[PDB]
Symmetry: D2
Subunit: 490 residues, 4 copies
């Protein structure tokens, strides 16, 4: 008899144990959480507006000929502003994939610029990490620009940039313009305007969303905290809740503000989680602001929101798409529980199941490889020919990589977890492809964390078998109750 | 048909893939690698000499009544110099176990001093991490002192220390004396003297050791790099190789220096891995030193040793018990491959197999718990009574913790990996209970890394199953060859 | 005899020696350098627009009753975002003046929040230094807000902020809104619009400016480097050169661009001094940009955008040694931390005009403080460690305190920009670090030849300034506790000559 | 008239004002404070033992031919472990003197390794500052080693070290062996043994020391805080008080312990000023330690071990305000960075004895430099930006360089401890930061009453020292580019009076 689990595309995955019965408040991000933007239409829109901004700022007209390719970028890549490389790294800074423009650099060639295949993530001045879903157009745009100036006769390829005659143009300064142009497109309203004049093309609409939020408000409180203003929030949220019937069958429609006990616009994260700004009330009918204490607020801080709701830290589950540093934990008051929305998880779960032949063949090659060394020890002079097997492993592994995209899986490359995956294991108590998967779990559910096995755990059976004394080293009242309570959330 | 694996207590576990055929040099630490000290006799000896040093420095005579208890300490604990706590933390600074003296603090009581059950490891001034095998006596000694002054009428318990009348004594200043006393015991020769006057009581002796080192020297080079001087190294290494016969059956004995192409004493690690000191030759027959370039050297640096052997970075496998920071990788030349000796792995593998009933019962409780929620979703008002099941899970989990010791497993507490385990996954390419497990592997073996599965990988079958558009988001030449080569070591 | 010196209000003061003969390129900032803004008119304009912006985003209407008081703020104050205090500190972080709102905290009361009368300047999370001339309205606004919320009964005063009912408003959060509002005023054109629509009210004009710049271009190159766009620069620069003549009266007028070899707008300082942005040449006829440099006929233009200080060096064909950069801003140790040669610096400190007036027209106060100090030494004369006397000095100290306070108020409520009492301010030490030369205005260079050798004045330590170069005949032998019983052919340094 | 001042060699110089009347506790370091070591005898003893230690661990025999040269090192030099240079820098990291071995690098050649003539002092991995008097032999040894390996043909000179055949020896690695050897000399008793076996040769004795300390204990408390053990302290202190009389001649001798209220050995500075170690009272009769304080009859002892500065404050019942700590070491911003009140500081700078002699007995050199500077101003008199003249000053500059170099050599090969030319050294700025008072020796306090008010001297900026307090009548109006067209009741600071 095996353990029961819900369907794979309906599950909420557990990183740290969480008792849902103790949750009193449900907090939501808006962008890419409640308002899931259609891929790759939204990435293509941000890509176009950023290219237009760069062209209107002095960049050549050939950039207008670029088109966003959703098959290339993968979230969490590191851009080397010194050499103009997009880097896929592991949890400790080791290099997994290195792309200069559109050319993927092989192993021995990589050691010319990275002698130990290692980068220091601390070097924030040199390395820029593209972790957000808004960074997806920026990720592909950086590759197009490095590719363009590298294969352009008017420019001269160099180690740290390009030459336009007797004038040098570094990757760092070029990266600055791309950074300023993306900030411009987002903070000038160019992207917001094109979005709210065509919600059906860019914003996903689902009736499951008002159903889950209504059930959350029956067992506790629900609040919204978005960096966007109220105007853009009102248009987006009205679209997300525009249905002829209400949540329950046969019921009538009610405004989206009815599902929230507290609505907070202009959050200004991540400053929001520290001191933030002064909290000010918002008059929706007029747009007038007034500091101090309706349900629509502006600015403030996460602690001010925590106090207005009468909740405490661990009573809140914050649901969003963003990964934040250990700045909320460093506070002297309790931090929130986290639910990380990872939209890529939908396509990655399809590869995990609908490509079983690639996984099964990969395991068969490893069993066959282990048989060739089955009879060998430190006295064996033999060297079994594995060139044919390894060459087949690399082909199958690469075919699996291309199932996710040119940059491979978001969570791993081969046997190594990516830097992004380790940041998920750090920040997210729970994670899924969408917050809507909570609809398939009771509000009294006990989310239990799955053990993450080390090599000496996953490759050793619990079955019972002289041992060398070099390993055994020749081999206060004890507690009677459990010394830890991080698996029951009690 | 299942994959073949060698016996569990003979295996070398693979963190990152390593092709042994490419290794040309084998580097060895001496302490706790070649010279494995008998437990708990060696920890008890260092505990006694440190207590005597503290008593001879002004500490009360009651400390002489303490005896080292091997069942209490576990390597990798964090000592909070502000509150005098031994802390077992995870990879991200979250608290798992908290002990003040010998009293284990429960959950809600811990949040008084740690509001988010979180510490900042960056605070090196406040938090001291006890990662070495030499820190084991120090770990238990800190608990004895906190326990002693807490339950002593002559002193007054406080938050950050104790009161001896109108005089305050903080945990930080007390920790300083323990730190200075351990340095004194090691660097005064008190521990070295008691060791070399009774090698059979404190040092493990094994004939497998000269056999493996001889086979290493037949396929490549072997070097030694120890912080100890030549006098202590000569006595220890002569003991380790004192056998009537040589390595091969019927062969005769030859000196221990014959197994090494280069012997380096006074390494002065970790400075050794940077600029180190000036390399100086050592005359063994006289003890005279001379800077510049026998096989016995003193001081130097890891790059000087790398050049004397004619080897390059990845051609070397450094075998030792110590975990070093990302200082060797930051160099502009290639770093070494690593083999981490973890002596605790011998006892931990026994618990993994000889306690199968505890693991099986723990899995049965989780299957039974999943059945109670099998029919529930976000509409279910029911709250299944799990108080009896959880109370049983905590008892079984605690019984498993006590199998490793009062502080639990070195690698995990419950479902969370310890800070020590994540440092193993970062630094060690390979790890085992001893370097002697290489004797059961051919020098052409391809050590292949085992995938470390995330929750969404280990709890989802590859078997094939409308999906919500909130999760799917309404869904450059591609490379033809593999984009990464960190699984074949090529 | 005595050394000749030019008139005090025409002087250029020298921190480090500089041979003007070797300067082949002259660089200019625009704001508060070439375009000197009227005081206190321009400060009050920024104050109004910033208060207006705060009220539009929810701050109470009582802020509209605030009026900028030019007699309160001194540049270079530190705002403690934890306790809401404006702090005047010395070069090492010691507290000199502490003001909570408009209330000045004195002596023992300061130790409640600052036990050692000391702050850690490195704690940039807590302390914000208001060094720029654009920070002057921001400095006075921060004091107005702290004073208003303290006095207004609608708010309860706490140690680190105020309580508005159940809501706590920290000083740090209030400071954030002030910074956001100041940036909004500058970076939404509201300040630029009011400036260009009344340039006679806000911008100073002087006919000596084209004359001095024309003489600079006769001996070398001249360039402009500003963070403003070309549109605002054109309106400002055309105004500064709007005279019915050229450099000399009677000569023909010529456009302001003719006075420069390179015009760099959108500089993006201080990022300009590192990697900056991609250099793009501006077509003033069209306004369109193009990265790099034009190749056709438009290459004869001199207007560029973005770029970096290294790129401007390459365009001018000038090494950093040969460049004198003239501006009002103090930059950190970055331009010299590189491997490329950094620029020489001329710092514009407009407050020097007023401070030099106090230094000369208030000689009565300086003479009395010296008299009181001479009389103090007389009371302790012929006293040593065996003397039991305790001369009554409380009468003299009260006169010292009274005369010293009257001197401070000659500069304003926060005192002199450079010192408070006998201690130099944090601002004064940063002038010493950054500036090779400094003056109230770059226009004082009009009174020096371009062959002039600016020789640095010695900054004397206490044992140098209070001891004469006279043979001290000691009858009793010097204590061996002090003497420890102790009984190259060419010069090894060259920073006072600058002749490499 | 003129202000009265005590004789220059008896003066105590004042950086920050200090009312001695409020000082209730006097703290003393021992090494180079109470126990002033003979110069250059003690430096040469440390040099020999350090060279001897290096040779015993493999360094070549030619090092035994080295002889300490007291005329070479100046305190406070920076050793560049990358390029093997000794650097004399100013308060901001600008290079003044660069010496590779015994070769002084001048002017343009310095820019090869230091392109902006600048170092980043924060790079403690690369730069090591030799501030202490114990660093004096270490300073000269580093130059000897660089010079030897450069000249010896057995080694090939590289940019960052030397090649001994196929082995590269970096300057950083060589510097590590020097530091290890210096610590080994001090912390293995070899220097203590040679010191105590010949105290007349290495330690200065003066009868004024017990007199001054006895007068201090009449007006307050006196304590000792040293890193040395009690055994070495007893031998040293008994020597310093070994006279056939007490404080005054004709009075009875009494043990040195009678002059103190608290004796703190094994201080573990600078850790002492933070958390330190556990305080333990020493039983001088037995030598055994005991944490805390004795409760029986032994509580009347005054000898303690370890502890912290806060604990010593509590034992003396003294707030940090009331304590004047007298020593030779400069500490960073830590004692005042706490929440507890820090100590006032008296810095002992024994080099002042020699530097004051140069300042007075070499007045001919100062008078000529002033004459040359007056004549330089005369050549440029009546010249402005329109003048095309270029007066010949190369003759005067060579005389300025020659006279300046002769002045530097009066201090030694590395020049004065406090300045090089017109720029203060990095050491001088640290004296300004740390020390409230300073002198060649604490014994100069013998010439001041305990009611004396030490008043800080103004450290004048260029625009204050080169401008008189005289009304400047300007006929032409001041340029509005400089003036910007601009037309509390009690004192707000108290650091010059110190009367809280």
């Amino acid at each position: 008899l095996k353990k029961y689990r819900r369907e794979a595309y309906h599950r909420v995955f557990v990183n740290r144990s969480l008792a849902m019965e103790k949750i009193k408040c449900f907090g939501f991000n808006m962008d890419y959480t409640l308002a899931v933007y259609k891929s790759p239409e939204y990435e293509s829109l941000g890509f176009e507006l950023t290219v237009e901004r760069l062209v209107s700022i002095g960049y050549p007209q050939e950039l207008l000929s670029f088109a966003y390719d959703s098959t290339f970028p993968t979230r969490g890549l590191v851009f080397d502003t010194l050499y103009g490389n997009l880097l896929k790294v592991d949890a400790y800074g080791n290099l997994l994939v290195c792309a200069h423009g559109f050319n993927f650099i092989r192993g021995p060639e990589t050691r010319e610029q990275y002698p130990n295949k290692f980068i220091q993530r601390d070097d924030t001045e040199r390395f820029y990490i593209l972790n957000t879903l808004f960074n997806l157009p920026e990720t592909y745009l950086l590759a197009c620009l490095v590719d363009f100036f590298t294969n352009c006769p008017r420019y001269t390829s160099c180690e740290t940039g390009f030459k336009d005659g007797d004038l040098f143009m570094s990757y760092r300064s070029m990266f600055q313009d791309v950074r300023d142009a993306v900030d411009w497109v987002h903070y000038k309203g160019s992207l917001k305007e094109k979005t709210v004049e065509n919600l059906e093309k860019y914003v996903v609409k689902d009736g499951k969303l008002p159903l889950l939020l209504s059930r959350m408000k029956e067992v506790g409180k629900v609040f919204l905290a978005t960096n966007s203003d109220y105007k853009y929030t009102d248009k987006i949220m009205t679209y997300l809740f525009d249905f002829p019937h209400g949540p329950k069958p046969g019921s009538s429609h009610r405004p989206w503000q009815s599902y929230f006990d507290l609505i907070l616009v202009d959050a200004r994260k991540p400053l929001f989680f520290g001191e933030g700004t002064v909290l000010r009330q918002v008059d929706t009918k007029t747009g007038k602001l007034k500091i101090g204490t309706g349900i629509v607020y502006s600015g403030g801080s996460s602690d001010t929101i925590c106090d207005l709701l009468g909740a405490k830290g661990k009573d809140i589950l914050y649901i969003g798409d963003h990964i934040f540093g250990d700045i909320l934990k460093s506070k002297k008051r309790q931090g929130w529980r986290t639910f990380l929305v990872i939209p890529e998880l939908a396509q990655e779960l399809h590869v995990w199941t609908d490509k079983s032949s690639l996984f099964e063949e990969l395991q068969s090659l490893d069993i066959f490889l282990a048989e060739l060394y089955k009879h060998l020890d430190s006295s064996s002079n033999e060297r079994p020919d594995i060139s044919s097997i390894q060459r087949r492993i690399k082909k199958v592994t690469h075919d699996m990589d291309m199932c996710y995209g040119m940059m491979g899986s978001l969570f791993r490359s081969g046997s190594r977890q990516t830097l992004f995956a380790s940041q998920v294991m750090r920040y997210a108590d729970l994670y899924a492809a969408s917050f809507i998967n909570l609809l398939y779990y009771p509000f009294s559910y006990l989310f239990r964390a799955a053990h993450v096995l080390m090599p000496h755990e996953s490759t050793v059976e619990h079955t019972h078998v002289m041992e060398s004394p070099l390993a055994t080293r020749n081999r206060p009242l004890a507690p009677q109750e459990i010394t830890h309570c991080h698996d029951e959330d009690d």
